[PDB]
Fold this protein.
Amino acid sequence: SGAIYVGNYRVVNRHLATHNDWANLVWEDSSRDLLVSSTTAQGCDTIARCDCQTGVYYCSSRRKHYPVSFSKPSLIFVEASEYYPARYQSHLMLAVGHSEPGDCGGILRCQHGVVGIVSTGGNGLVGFADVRDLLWLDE
Ligand SMILES: CSc1cscc1CC(=O)N1CCC[C@H](C(N)=O)C1
Ligand SMILES: [Zn+2]
């Protein structure tokens, strides 16, 4: 679990969104596993606006932060689930690192701010849904 709180927005994995998130829906994209809902309170997370390929992510299955080198956001295959059929997920960045299903929502950050959130994983790899291209989160 986990979310990014920037201004009057809350960004979560689309497959983990609540009834409240869907009733206060701003934007969602199944191909990216992202959903953004409105909030009444203000958020203060800085979103990175960069092309960084190194950072640190939170891993709740280990209660630890891990430094990682990660790929550029791209289309990558992902297998089925009670959530999605086998398909390609866009805007996905991969790193060598530990992750389990409950790890989705953990934030990935570089020196510039929030890069994205844990969204996929398996076989010693972890995947992050990029948020750096969503320029409207700041306006
Ligand atoms: C960090 S997720 C994870 C680690 S080991 C097994 C997993 C599961 C995983 O990758 N899923 C299942 C939940 C929906 C995800 C998606 N974004 O399509 C795909
Ligand atoms: Zn950066």
About this structure: The longest helix spans residues 19-23. The chain has two domains: 3-44, 45-139. The CA atoms of residues 118 and 128 lie 4 Å apart. The longest strand covers residues 34-44.
